[PDB]
Symmetry: C3
Subunit: 428 residues, 3 copies
């Protein structure tokens, strides 16, 4: 049926020691909470009620979704209190799913299982078994059926023996949640309203609670300091690296591979050590990536070979291109088939012709290069400048924009150019 | 006595998701099967019968050995079938060793032990003990003597308790193998001919089977997808790094060290993080390698210091040379004693004089530099060009090949050179 | 009370396979023994008696401390013999602490606990419990009180069952040590004098030995070959990385982070993969460090962003500066607020003006740049050269030191400059 998601970002992140609200800190180039939001959209949630208690300005500034509903928690009286703030927006028919902004790695597949498990008029609860539960609410089951959740402090000595604990993620009818949430109370040592209390309410009402379990423990792990964030970073990266390897993308060393975004890979792609991929990268068949490269929001043609320690940003490479080592492609760069970019060469808003080489110490700016052109070592453009097909450029040539150069033109070393040059005309 | 090796590359590598046959995929810069071939040559195998079922063109294209004998397996009817294809080439006197192209890390030392263990007219079989054998053929021993191998499917419940399993590597007389291989049959669920059946044949004939065990489990691990290949890559690299450390080569971080080839190291060599060595590298005493460097098929003199993020290919450095950071040496580069190559400097088919510096933004091409020369920042050569001893070159000087420059010549900044220059003559 | 430290560097480092004495080899940019010396100074040791048997010249050459007292051990007759050599310098009142130069990671906090534990006229001994003690002296306790140390060779079969072993670190009154050290003897298979014998002497005299335990086993681990050194390197680095993460410094990947020295970090600092920090680095609030950067003895202003694969040495950056990618800052470089250094740009003993850009292929040497200056791509200085505020420099301009350039000057591309330039004067 229909569903909505409640993401909780109310928890204050003092241990982060940051001015940025905890949930906005990045994991793999994307804020933690955005991982949770993206899961909610995949599941098809109609609305995403985000509950925050601090850093409102930064949260709205960073996060923009059409269905994003902002819910203030004036003071931090606990998970149960937070769900009360969002309860008015719950629709009676829709199932309401409860997620946390500091638990980025919850899997969409595990959430789909949780929804199926929800009995009607009942609750589906994500639970996990820990070799050592300590300070964790313990699932209490009689005759194999869930009856409630016992906080560790209130835990009896027998209940401190239960391996199963509470993740805090659950699913319930929207109307049911509004009924239980009204019954909540603050009479307890902390003074908080604990969401866990609704599980007992369901059992007392004769409704059933069904528990499912996550595939990995990482899915339910949450972040409270930079160290745990760095740990989940490595978990996420290694999870992606194994998938890519089994999909036929070779990684020389999976531990030294960072993917921040989405990769579309052809067959027989090879990626060496310490490569970082960012944004949306597209790699063709038989693409090679040298050690230490960084590629962001770029497309690489089939059979291109990027040599080591090259940096590419929003560039478009056709097939058979080669670049690097130490090449640098600014945004808007573009190479045609067979083009070579050499070491210590930069390109901004420029296009290099087919079979055109800029082998050394050359900067190209707001320029267009013809096919089969040869760019001299040390060539520099003070940007727009255009060059025709089959031009040769002398070593250390300077071209002052706007300069157009004719097809077949040949230019002498050391030349400095301020006028345009006729086709097939030698210039010195 | 005499020996030959049968390498099996018949297994088809669908899980690799590749056009390249599985056994050709690289581990540490060398195809897996080539690891096996190289082991066979160390052992002194007279012939290496490679049995393939697909990708013949690529295999012959890649692998060239004088003793390499190519054996087609028309269809993939199992290991026993494959050994039948090679059986005609077996010599009666020679012992025949059975290896696999997807098991790259089998150790030469473990294979030497296997040969000694072979009883005459009998079989030596490599076996290993696994905490969890599942789907593995189980060694069956009566009174401590081997009697056969039991596939897991046919395994009885007691036999599913045996820790010892079959590696698939074995040694037998060449004549014996031809006798057993004839007796093989396809009557079984798969329809394959299992090589494991010969072990029972030996026991029924009264001949003895003797089992040895590998030193590491990695030696017998085989590759069927990119992930397992990447795992063996890390195993191999870490095995080399420990050896180098105990041999007196310091590695700042062994996990971030990749050796693809053979290293000859002097004493007191230090290698920082994320260095990659390729081909055949020779390092002198007290050589330093900066973080991120890549060295291929190059020789570095005693006491040379390569600064970080330098790339060197087929270069020859004398003692006391320094290069980098961000230096780049194309093939054929050569430095004399005391020479310095600075950042953003490239050298192709060039030689730098003794105590000669090219500190900045300089490209050198098909050139020869005299001793004590100073190369200006921005110097560029449009290649052959020669420079005498004790020359000074102005910043941003261009030299058009072929230009010869006299000893003691001093050249002005911005100069562009098309003629030769007399000794001790200032030029502007 | 007062204290002194005895560091033992007598052990000869044959397994290191080095000409450099073992204790001088570096861990995190600092010689192992210097870790021990630095611990001793934190504890406030009045004197540090270093006992060496070889490589005296290199040790004095490398290690310079005001309180460093050098004690020769003519021949290597064991720890007890070494302490005899230093015993004359012990003061009666001062407690004497026994440390080892090959145990770099001993913690100052664990040593403070050891001192408190020392009974008067008695001994405090650092001990540890090992799942497998083998070849380790075993602590022998009767009624819970220490009575002696039993070498493993002399160990009885019951004593080979004791988990507690001897670290070799201990504390005793200076006078007491002189009394026990006199009683030592060489009558044993090795012929050595074992320091462990004094523990029994104390028990026989009725004095008490009190054992404390280290926090980590790494604190008491010692180095005898390059491999163990590399292991302690990784232990030390990962220990620092966790501290920085909990302190609010984000590390994208803690395993790929090396700190060699001391870091002062503002809030919300982010450090990407494979960064190396050296010497004394100071980072402001919200500083970003790109993948692969190296920073040494440098100060980075608030909000500076260092792009990847940049190398910085003894540079001083004000707030809001940006540099890289592929930027290189030689020692003495300095940037003013808002300055940008682009790719393939070097700076030595130079200062870049506020909001001043050197975007491409530019070398700056012994120069001073005015605010709002624009530095053309390919600009080169043959160093002192000065530039006024609001100057523009053409692409590939060369300036020959000493050249002063006026405020507001604008210079043409390809120009080469040997004279000074008047304010607001265009030059070509």
């Amino acid at each position: 049926s229909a569903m909505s998601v409640v993401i909780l970002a109310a928890g204050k992140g003092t241990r982060m020691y940051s001015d940025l609200p905890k949930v906005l800190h990045t994991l793999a180039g994307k804020p933690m909470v955005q991982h949770v939001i993206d899961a909610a959209k995949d599941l098809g949630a109609a609305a995403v009620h985000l509950v925050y208690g601090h850093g409102g300005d930064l949260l709205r500034q960073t996060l923009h979704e059409d269905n994003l509903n902002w819910v203030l928690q004036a003071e931090q009286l606990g998970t149960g209190h937070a769900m009360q703030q969002a309860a008015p927006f719950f629709s009676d028919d829709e199932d309401i799913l409860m997620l946390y902004g500091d638990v980025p790695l919850i899997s969409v597949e595990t959430l789909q299982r949780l929804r199926a498990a929800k009995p009607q008029g009942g609750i589906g609860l994500l639970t996990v078994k820990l070799d050592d539960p300590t300070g964790y609410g313990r699932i209490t089951r009689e005759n194999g059926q869930v009856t409630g959740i016992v906080e560790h402090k209130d835990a009896s000595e027998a209940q401190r023996q239960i391996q199963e604990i509470n993740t805090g993620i659950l699913v319930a009818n929207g109307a049911d949640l509004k009924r239980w949430l009204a019954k909540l109370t603050n009479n307890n040592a902390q003074g908080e309203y604990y969401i866990t209390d609704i599980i007992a309410m369901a059992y007392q009402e004769g409704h059933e609670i069904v528990a499912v379990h996550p595939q990995r423990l990482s899915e339910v792990e949450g972040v409270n300091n930079r160290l745990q964030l760095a740990r989940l970073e490595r978990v996420y990266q290694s999870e992606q690296a194994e998938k890519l390897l089994l999909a036929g993308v070779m990684l020389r060393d999976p531990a030294r591979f960072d993917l921040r975004g989405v990769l579309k890979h052809g067959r027989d792609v090879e990626i060496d050590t310490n490569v970082i991929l960012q944004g949306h990268v597209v790699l063709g068949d038989r693409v090679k990536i040298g050690a230490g490269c960084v590629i962001k929001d770029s497309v690489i043609g089939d059979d291109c070979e990027i040599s080591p320690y090259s940096v590419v940003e929003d560039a478009q490479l056709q097939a058979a291109c080669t670049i690097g080592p130490f090449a640098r492609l600014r945004p808007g760069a573009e190479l045609l088939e067979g083009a070579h970019v050499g070491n210590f060469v930069e390109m901004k808003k420029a296009r290099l012709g087919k079979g055109s080489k800029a082998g050394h110490l050359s900067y190209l700016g707001d320029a267009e290069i013809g096919d089969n052109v040869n760019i001299g070592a040390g060539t520099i453009t003070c940007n727009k400048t255009i060059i025709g097909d089959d031009v040769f450029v002398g070593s250390d040539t300077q071209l002052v924009a706007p300069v157009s150069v004719g097809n077949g033109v040949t230019i002498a070393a050391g030349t400095t150019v301020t006028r345009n040059i006729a086709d097939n005309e030698l210039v010195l």
